[PDB]
Design a binder for these strands. Sequence first.
RNA 1: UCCGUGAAUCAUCGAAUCUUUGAACGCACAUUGCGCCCCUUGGUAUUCCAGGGGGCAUGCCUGUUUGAGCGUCAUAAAAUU
RNA 2: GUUUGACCUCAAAUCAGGUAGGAGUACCCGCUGAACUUAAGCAUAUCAAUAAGCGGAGGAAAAGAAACCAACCGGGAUUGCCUUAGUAACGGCGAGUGAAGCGGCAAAAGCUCAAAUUUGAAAUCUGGUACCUUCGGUGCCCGAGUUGUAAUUUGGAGAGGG
RNA 3: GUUCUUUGUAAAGUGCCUUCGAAGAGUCGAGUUGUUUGGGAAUGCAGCUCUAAGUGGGUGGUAAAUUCCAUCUAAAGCUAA
RNA 4: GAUGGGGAAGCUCCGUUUCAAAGGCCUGAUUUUAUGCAGGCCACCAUCGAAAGGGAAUCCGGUUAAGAUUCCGGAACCUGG
RNA 5: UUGACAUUGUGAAGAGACAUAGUUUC
Lengths: 203, 371, 204, 60, 122
Amino acid sequence: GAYKYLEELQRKKQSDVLRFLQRVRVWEYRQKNVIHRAARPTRPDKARRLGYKAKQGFVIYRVRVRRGNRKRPVPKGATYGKPTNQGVNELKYQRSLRATAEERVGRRAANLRVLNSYWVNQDSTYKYFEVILVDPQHKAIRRDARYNWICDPVHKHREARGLTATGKKSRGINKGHKFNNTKAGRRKTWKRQNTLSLWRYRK
Amino acid sequence: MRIKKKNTRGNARNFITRSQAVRKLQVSLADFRRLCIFKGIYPREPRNKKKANKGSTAPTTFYYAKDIQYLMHEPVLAKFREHKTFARKLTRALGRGEVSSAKRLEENRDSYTLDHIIKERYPSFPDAIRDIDDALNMLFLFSNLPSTNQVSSKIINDAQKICNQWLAYVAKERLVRKVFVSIKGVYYQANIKGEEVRWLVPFKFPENIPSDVDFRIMLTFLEFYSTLLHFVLYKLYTDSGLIYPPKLDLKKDKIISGLSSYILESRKYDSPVASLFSAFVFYVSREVPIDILEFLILSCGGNVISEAAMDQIDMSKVTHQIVDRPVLKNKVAGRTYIQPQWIFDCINKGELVPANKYLPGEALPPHLSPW
Amino acid sequence: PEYVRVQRQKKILSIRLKVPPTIAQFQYTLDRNTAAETFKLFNKYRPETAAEKKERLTKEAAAVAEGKSKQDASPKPYAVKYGLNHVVALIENKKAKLVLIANDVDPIELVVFLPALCKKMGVPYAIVKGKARLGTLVNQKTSAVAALTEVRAEDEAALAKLVSTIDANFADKYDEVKKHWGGGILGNKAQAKMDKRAKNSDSA
Amino acid sequence: QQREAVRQLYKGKKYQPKDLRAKKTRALRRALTKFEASQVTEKQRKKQIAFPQRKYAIKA
Amino acid sequence: KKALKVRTSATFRLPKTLKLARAPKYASKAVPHYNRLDSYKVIEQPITSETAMKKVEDGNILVFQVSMKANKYQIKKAVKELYEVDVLKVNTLVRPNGTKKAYVRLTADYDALDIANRIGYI
RNA sequence: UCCGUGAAUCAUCGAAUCUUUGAACGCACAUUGCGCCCCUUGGUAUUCCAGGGGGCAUGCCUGUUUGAGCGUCAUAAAAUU
RNA sequence: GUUUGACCUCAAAUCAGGUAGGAGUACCCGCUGAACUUAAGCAUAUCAAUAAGCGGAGGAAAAGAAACCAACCGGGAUUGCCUUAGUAACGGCGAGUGAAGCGGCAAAAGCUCAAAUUUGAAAUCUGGUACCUUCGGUGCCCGAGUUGUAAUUUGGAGAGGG
RNA sequence: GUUCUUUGUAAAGUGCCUUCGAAGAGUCGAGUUGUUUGGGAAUGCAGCUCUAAGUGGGUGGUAAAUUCCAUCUAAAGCUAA
RNA sequence: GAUGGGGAAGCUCCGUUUCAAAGGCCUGAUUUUAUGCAGGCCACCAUCGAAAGGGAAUCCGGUUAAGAUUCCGGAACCUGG
RNA sequence: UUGACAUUGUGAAGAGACAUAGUUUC
C-alpha cells in the first residue's frame, strides 16, 4: 500500500516537494499555541512504526520547543568558587530536546500516557515534535491485550523517568563494551562498585 | 444590610418578558407558544407596569416567572429537542443520499405523548368534564373545512373518526336535551353525569380558510384535544361498560359514513327524554339532511330509513315521513306527515306536540330558543 | 477569530509561494461537467450498506444448511473499491479501470505519488474535486481515493467512452505538467502596484 | 433503612452512586478488572491451546 | 456567487449556543441528608444565673444558650415552635466561654413567668 | 429476671456518622465575608420574608448536543414561426 | 447554485462519563549540582559524576530477549555473588584513581508490533438503551472507523502455490 | 475426586516441490563545542552545522588508505524470579 | 495578584487589558418551509488592598456588683418592598 | 563588539562555466 511511498519519500528532506511543503507547515505551526491538538497524524506510517492505531484512545499533540543551549540561571552570571567553569552559554543539558517536549505535554494531559514521540519540523528558533498519547481509562484500551499493559500504574509518566526510546538513548542504555559505564544504569552500577562487601567469615 | 439595589424585588422578580422567557428556556419563539397551550400558561398583568419594566412605558406582556420556573422541567421539552435533531440528521441522510439508513430512522423515533400532562391538569375525571365543552367545538369545526395547506389532509380524517365515537356514545345512551338551530349550526346540551355540555355541529359548508390566524398553531390545539378525548371516551365507554374504540364498518363508511356504522359492544333509561319516539319508525324523504336528523332520532328511541339509502340501494313498517318539501305527492294515509321542526319542539320539551300543526307546508313558530 | 484568520492566510500563503510542479498537477482538476457524468456512473455501483449486509447473510444462513452452497447461491459483487491501500493493492497488479483522486487531502503527500504511479502502470485516472463526495458514494465521510475494477456487461460502453474521454482530457496532456511551477500569483494591491510602476514607466 | 431501600432500586444497573460503591482503595478502584487481565490476544490463545505447559515426571 | 452577511459591527463576539441542564445517571450522595438544625438542636439550655431572673420580670425576657451556627431568625422560629409564643425581638451575643447567649423578649400578650414554670427551672 | 438477644474505656469489625478546614474545588479569606441555581416547607402570601434539602473549580480524554469560518461554493456561449 | 446539503476546521456547554494534582519519599528512575577536604600553598586534579535542589514510580523499581561477547573445538536475554583485580588503564604519570571478557554459583522464561489486498463482501470496537445468570452477556440504536479497525507473519523465520 | 456439558470436519502441528521473502531517516554517520568516563586521538551523552545506503548497516579498544574475514541486525514494544 | 498567553529541566517566572470567539438586550403573524429560529441593538473585562480616607439613617431620660448611641421607657429616622 | 553559517524565498542588470541550445561559480 502507501506505506513505503511515504516512508521512502519521507527521507528525501531536502527535495523540492518537501521543502516547500515543510515551509508551509512551519508557518502554520508557529501561529498556534505552544501545545495544541493535531487532529490527525502528519506522518501516519511513521506513527505506525511507533505503534499508533487509529481508534478512540489515541491523541496526537503537536508540540513546540525552543532550540539552543542551556543557560545556568545564576544571577548576574556569577560562579562562586573554582573559576574553572567556562562560559555560561556552554552548558549543554544532558537530555535531548525531544525528551523535553514529551514532558512539556506530559505535565499537561496527566490522564493520558505518553507513548512515544518524533520529529516533524524545525527552525533556527524552534524545533517541533509530534507526540502519541494513550488513555488508559478508555475501555477500548483496557481490552485489546496488545496495549493494556500500559494501564498498569507502573507506567505513569514514562517520559519523566525517561523510559521511552529517546529516554533510553539519552540515558544511554544499550549492550556492548562501549556502554560499560552505564549498561544497567549509571548510578546503580556506580553504587555497586563503590561499596565494601563484608562477609561473615572475612575472606 | 447594605442598601439593596431597587430593581430586583417584587414586581421585577415576579414577572418577566416574553423575550426574556424565550431566552431563558433556550427554545424558540413558536415552540414557546406551543407550550403555553400545553401547560398552558396564560400571560399576566402586573398592577404597575413601569415598576415591572424598569421605567419603560412600553407594550410588553408578562408571565408569572415562577410558572416558567416551573415550566423548565417539563419532559415534553426534551422531545422537541429530540425532534429537532431528527430534522437535522434526516436531511443529511438525503443530502448525501442514503435511503437504507434514512427510513430506518423514521421507525426509530418517538412522538411525544400528552398522558402525564392531562392527568395532572385534570385530576382526574370530573374536572375536564366541566371543560370538555370548549374542546369539542373546534373539532367539529376542523372536521368541516376542506383540504387546504397547514392542515395536511391526513388530519381531517381522524376528526371524522373521533367525532363519530362522540355521537356513538350519546345515541346509544340517549342523552340529548336542549336542541337549538341557528345559522351558526345547531346548538345542543347533554347532561352527561351531572355537568351539562352545550355543544355545536356547524353547517357542513366548505367555506374559505381566512388565513389570518396561524394554522401551525391550531394543529397543536387539535392534537391537544385529541389526546384528551381519547382518555375521556376511553373511560366513558368502559363506564357504560363498552369497548373502546368502536370498530366502524368500512362499507357502511361507504354507505353514509355515519351512524349505521361504528358498532359498539360491552366489556332502563333517563325518563322522560330517553325512550321517546320508541318503537316508532320513520322513513325520511330524500331532500332532508340525514346528517342532522338521524342522530336526533336514534338518541330518542326512534328508527330511521332514508331515501338516501335507496338511490344506492319495500317501505311497509315505518310510521311517519319527516319531509321538508313544498309539495308532497302522493303521500300515505297510514303515515303522518310533518316538517322537521316538530323534532325540535318535542325534545325541547319532551312533551310531544302533535303532528297536526307543521304538516307541510303549514306555518311555523321559528324556534323559541331553549335558553 | 484566529482560526478563521489562520485558515485564510494559509490559503493566501499556498498561492503566493512558487509551488513545485509535482504538486499543482492538482487543481487542474476535472471539470464539473464530466465529473457530474462520472458520479452517475459510480452511484450505480455503491458498496453494500450494513442493512443489506445484515440481510444477505440471513438469506444464505437460511440457504446454507437448507439448500447447498458455499454461499454461492449469493450473487457476485459489483461495487467500487475504496480502501487506500486496497486501491494501491489493486493497482500494480494491475486490476483497476479508473482511479479517482481527491484534490484536497490534508496530508497532501498521501496522494502525490499516485498520478505518477498510474502513468507508469498504464492506469487511466483522474483528479476530481472533493474527497467528501468521494465519501458519499461509499458511505464514509471522506475517501480520498475511488477505484473500480469490474462492471456489469451493459454498463461497459459508457465506461469505455469516459476512459477515452478522461485520458485525453488528463493523462496524455499532462506529462509536460512535470513543468509549470505554479503559485506565482500576487495580491491585488500588489497587482495594481506593479502595473502603475510598469505602465507609467512605459507611458504618460 | 433508607440505604437498604436505595440499594434495591439501584440494584442491577450500571452507575450506582459512588458512596454505595466499593471503597476498597484508590489503587484498586483503578487497576484493571479480572476480565481485563484474563483478556488475551487471539494469537497466543491459539498458542496456548496448541501447546499448553504439559505435565511430566522423570523416573523411568 | 457569495452573499456575505453584512456586519456593521467591527467586533466579533462568541456566538450564543445551547447550554444544557445536567441529566445525572445516578444520584449525588444517594440519601438526602436529614435536617442539621431542627428546634431541639438549636436551643440548648436556658441560663439560670440570678441576673437572668431580673430580665424575666423587668423585661418579660427569656434567655437561652443557643448553638453557634444558629441566628436570630432560626432562634425566633424555634422558640415559636417549642412553646407557641410570639416573640417581639431577639438580641444575641457570644459569651466568652464559647457559647451564644440570646435574649428573647416576648410579646406583650404573653408572660415569661408562665413558660418558666412550664419549662421547669425557675 | 440469674438461665439471658446480654455488663464492658473488653475483643473483633464487613454498617453508618463524620464540625470547620485542608491537594481544597461557587468567589474570597487578616473576614465565620459575598453570590448564583434548583427543589421543598412556613409565616395572612402571585410579588415580601424565613427555614430546609441539592447544586455551581481547573486541565484533559471519550461521547452527545449546539455551533461558527467564502477552509472547501463558483463556467458555459449561442439562437427561430 | 442570492440556494440546498455535506465535508473540513475550531469552539461551546453546571452536557453524558471519566481522569490529574497532595501525602509519604528507607530503597528506585531521572535531571540539576557545590565547597570545606587531599594535592604545598593552587587556576588541572581531588573530594565527586557525591551533599543540598527539582521531577516521577513501585512492593520492588530498573534492566531484560544481542545492531552481544569472542577470535575459541567458539559462547548466547537481563540481574546478583565469588573471582577476575587494586590488575589493563588514566593522571602537574604527582597526589591518586580504576574497569570489563572468560570461570563458578544463585535464579532461570520467553515474547509482541511496524512493514505483505479480507476484497466474494470491516470480518473490528466505544457508548446509549432493554432484558440478563452482571468484574460480564445478549439484543437494538447513535456512533467510531478505510487518511485503516480484526484475522494472518516478526527474522529463530515466514508467505503463496502444488 | 465427583458431575454436567462436549465440540469439530473446527483449529493447530509435521514432510516434500516451487516461487518469494516486505524488516523502523534529521535517524545512521561525520565535523564542532561542552560535559563525563579507565577509555587512551575521543568512553558516552547533549547542543549547533552537515546529512547516508540496501548483497546494506553496526562492531571487531591506535591515527589513515587498500584487500579480507568474523559476527550481529540499529534507530518500535512487553516480560516473573 | 490569577486567567488569556509567553518563558522556564523544574520549583515556578512574566505581566493586569493584555496577539482570546473574554455577554446581554430587544421585536416577532420572520408569512410560510409546513413539525429544525428569525431580525436587530449594545459595544468592557477576576479578585485583594484603610476598625484614622470615601461611606444610607438615633436621640434623651432611667437602670446593674459589673454592660450600654446596643437593655428599658419615651421620641425619631434610613433603606427596600 | 566584529565575522561566518543557519533561519532565508522570488527576480533583474554589470564580473567566472556548459566550449557560443538555459540546469548555474563573481
